[PDB]
Amino acid sequence: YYKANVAKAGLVDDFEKKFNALKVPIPEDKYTAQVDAEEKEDVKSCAEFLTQS
Amino acid sequence: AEVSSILEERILGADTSVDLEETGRVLSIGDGIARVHGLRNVQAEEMVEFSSGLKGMSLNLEPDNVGVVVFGNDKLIKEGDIVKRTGAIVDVPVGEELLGRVVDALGNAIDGKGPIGSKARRRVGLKAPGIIPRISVREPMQTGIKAVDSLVPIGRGQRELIIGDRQTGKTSIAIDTIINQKRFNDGTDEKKKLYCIYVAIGQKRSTVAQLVKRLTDADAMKYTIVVSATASDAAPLQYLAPYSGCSMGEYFRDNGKHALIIYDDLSKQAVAYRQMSLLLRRPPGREAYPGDVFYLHSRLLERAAKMNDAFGGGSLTALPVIETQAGDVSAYIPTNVISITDGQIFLETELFYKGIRPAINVGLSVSRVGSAAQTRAMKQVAGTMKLELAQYREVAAFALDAATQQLLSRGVRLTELLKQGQYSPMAIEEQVAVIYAGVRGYLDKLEPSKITKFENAFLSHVISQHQALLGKIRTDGKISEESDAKLKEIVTNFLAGF
Amino acid sequence: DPVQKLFVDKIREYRTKRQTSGGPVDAGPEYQQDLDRELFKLKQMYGKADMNTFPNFTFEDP
Ligand SMILES: Nc1ncnc2c1ncn2[C@@H]1O[C@H](COP(=O)(O)OP(=O)(O)OP(=O)(O)O)[C@@H](O)[C@H]1O
Numbered sequence: 001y002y003k004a005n006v007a008k009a010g011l012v013d014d015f016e017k018k019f020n021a022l023k024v025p026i027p028e029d030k031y032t033a034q035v036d037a038e039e040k041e042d043v044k045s046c047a048e049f050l051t052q053s
Numbered sequence: 054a055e056v057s058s059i060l061e062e063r064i065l066g067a068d069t070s071v072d073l074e075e076t077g078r079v080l081s082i083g084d085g086i087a088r089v090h091g092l093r094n095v096q097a098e099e100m101v102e103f104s105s106g107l108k109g110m111s112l113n114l115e116p117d118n119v120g121v122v123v124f125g126n127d128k129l130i131k132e133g134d135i136v137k138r139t140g141a142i143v144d145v146p147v148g149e150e151l152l153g154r155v156v157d158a159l160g161n162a163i164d165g166k167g168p169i170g171s172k173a174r175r176r177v178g179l180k181a182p183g184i185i186p187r188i189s190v191r192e193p194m195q196t197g198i199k200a201v202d203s204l205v206p207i208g209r210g211q212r213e214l215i216i217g218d219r220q221t222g223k224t225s226i227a228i229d230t231i232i233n234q235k236r237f238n239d240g241t242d243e244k245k246k247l248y249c250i251y252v253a254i255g256q257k258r259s260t261v262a263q264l265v266k267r268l269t270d271a272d273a274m275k276y277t278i279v280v281s282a283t284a285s286d287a288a289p290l291q292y293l294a295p296y297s298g299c300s301m302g303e304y305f306r307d308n309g310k311h312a313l314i315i316y317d318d319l320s321k322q323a324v325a326y327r328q329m330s331l332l333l334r335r336p337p338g339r340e341a342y343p344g345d346v347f348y349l350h351s352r353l354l355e356r357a358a359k360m361n362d363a364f365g366g367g368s369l370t371a372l373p374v375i376e377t378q379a380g381d382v383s384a385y386i387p388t389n390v391i392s393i394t395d396g397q398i399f400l401e402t403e404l405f406y407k408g409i410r411p412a413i414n415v416g417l418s419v420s421r422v423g424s425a426a427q428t429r430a431m432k433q434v435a436g437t438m439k440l441e442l443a444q445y446r447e448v449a450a451f452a453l454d455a456a457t458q459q460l461l462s463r464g465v466r467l468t469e470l471l472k473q474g475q476y477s478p479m480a481i482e483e484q485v486a487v488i489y490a491g492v493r494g495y496l497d498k499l500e501p502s503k504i505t506k507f508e509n510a511f512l513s514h515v516i517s518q519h520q521a522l523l524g525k526i527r528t529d530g531k532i533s534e535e536s537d538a539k540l541k542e543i544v545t546n547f548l549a550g551f
Numbered sequence: 552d553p554v555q556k557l558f559v560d561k562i563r564e565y566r567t568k569r570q571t572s573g574g575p576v577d578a579g580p581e582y583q584q585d586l587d588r589e590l591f592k593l594k595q596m597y598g599k600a601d602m603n604t605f606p607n608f609t610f611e612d613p
């Protein structure tokens with residue numbers, strides 16, 4: 001419909017095709033570095049705190 | 054290119070037929086009222102037309118001349134003009150073709166968007182359904198406001214009244230009711246779909262434009278008609294707009310469907326009628342309103358019926374909006390419409406500014422249907438809430454012992470529970486969940502200033518994790534024992550975790 | 552139907568308008584002035600982006 005109500009159907013067709021080809025990026029887990037924290041806990045609640053308790 | 058072509062398509066079909074028509078000469082035109090001379094066979098409240106394509110209605114049939122009211126501007130009618138009778142009582146288009154269209158009081162499209170494809174017409178001045186077609190009000194009309202769905206419930210076929218001062222939140226209640234019906238209209242069953250009609254009388258065009266764009270944003274014009282007789286529209290149009298909208302809704306109820314019509318305001322239809330009547334020279338009455346000012350409304354609100362299953366089963370709810378002056382409910386038109394309607398919804402400025410929004414004064418607001426036209430879950434919970442607020446209101450004017458201190462605590466918790474925002478109506482099951490949490494003494498631990506937080510948060514939790522429970526409550530339409538036990542554990546868990 | 556002389560007269564002035572529309576005939580300066588006015592209003596209301604192709608975003612991760 002959007003292409004069927006525009007004089008330059010070619011320009012909107014090009015917009016549509018560029019939309020089809022081009023996607024979007026996504027973030028990763030660098031901010032999630034808190035990963036490391038879990039390992040440290042594995043010492044207290046299970047190695048240091050657990051054993052001493 | 055094709056623009057001119059579609060323009061020609063309009064000429065291609067014209068109105069060749071010229072007929073021999075009865076006429077009359079305008080003896081005197083002034084103030085919007087013409088005194089035609091002739092038109093011997095013109096009927097009463099017939100539609101006549103002027104030489105410039107401008108319509109009018111023959112309201113007075115005096116022996117020597119016919120008093121005609123012009124549906125439009127009056128500068129274009131001269132003396133000695135020509136008035137042709139159309140031979141048809143005033144009538145308007147009706148049908149599903151009107152849905153989503155803004156139209157004027159006479160059914161002419163007002164937003165461009167082409168014309169109306171209506172294939173049928175209905176007379177504005179039709180008699181109300183008899184005593185036999187109707188049947189007591191059974192289903193509930195879901196408004197979305199907690200305080201209206203719980204404390205002053207509205208059924209389908211009822212005629213509630215929203216009465217208050219200026220800028221207390223009446224059009225807001227109307228728009229919330231309109232927007233809420235989206236969930237039912239999107240679904241599948243046709244027994245819940247409710248088509249909404251909004252009659253905007255005397256409101257400046259900017260307000261109606263804001264309203265229409267607001268409905269479009271909430272995607273609520275799929276099923277809404279807007280009949281606007283704004284301030285700049287001659288009095289004969291603001292007079293007639295309620296009746297046009299009521300015909301558009303009578304079409305729906307007469308065909309097994311359900312409709313909602315919202316006159317906004319009727320206190321301005323009364324003023325337009327008074328202007329008409331004073332310019333036809335009819336003697337004035339009390340406050341200058343004509344004597345027939347009660348009839349004006351009673352014949353209009355009596356068309357909001359609930360047809361029995363033999364007559365289709367369709368219904369037509371009505372929510373007239375009145376405007377009082379400084380809360381003087383005892384005025385003239387307010388009292389007339391109060392004694393015409395079923396329930397009422399009193400909005401008060403002292404409550405609007407005290408933080409209670411919607412200002413619904415639950416103490417005075419009434420609904421004759423009450424029990425009936427309420428879902429079983431809401432019936433179970435709102436009853437205890439009603440008793441608790443009734444007790445609280447007695448001992449509220451001050452602010453000791455544990456029992457009454459806890460009574461005040463519960464009352465305040467419920468009060469802050471009943472508040473709400475704008476254009477965010479809630480599904481009935483969500484209202485039940487919130488009110489249940491509030492009334493089962495759970496919130497009594499929390500501070501009151503924080504209650505709103507809980508409310509919001511609680512929903513955003515239940516709306517995702519516990520969709521199944523809400524679906525259960527909706528489908529079964531009651532708080533069964535297992536549903537109650539669930540609700541209990543959900544609320545107990547959430548309260549501590551927050 | 553071949554009788555309504557006004558009907559065919561309007562159709563004829565139509566056909567003439569069709570043929571003569573090489574450029575908006577009898578436009579006058581009001582034509583251009585208006586066109587500009589509402590074009591500028593629409594441009595302002597919509598945006599100033601690269602009104603030709605897709606402008607790029609280049610977001611920022613959390
Ligand atoms: N539930 C609500 N929460 C917050 N604000 C509200 C609520 N209801 C109404 N209002 C406010 O009240 C104002 C007036 O609302 P509304 O137009 O509904 O009242 P009204 O009596 O119809 O006004 P008028 O009669 O002048 O047209 C609005 O600007 C709105 O911000």
Ligand SMILES: [Mg+2]
Binds near residue numbers: 224
């Ligand atoms: Mg309003």
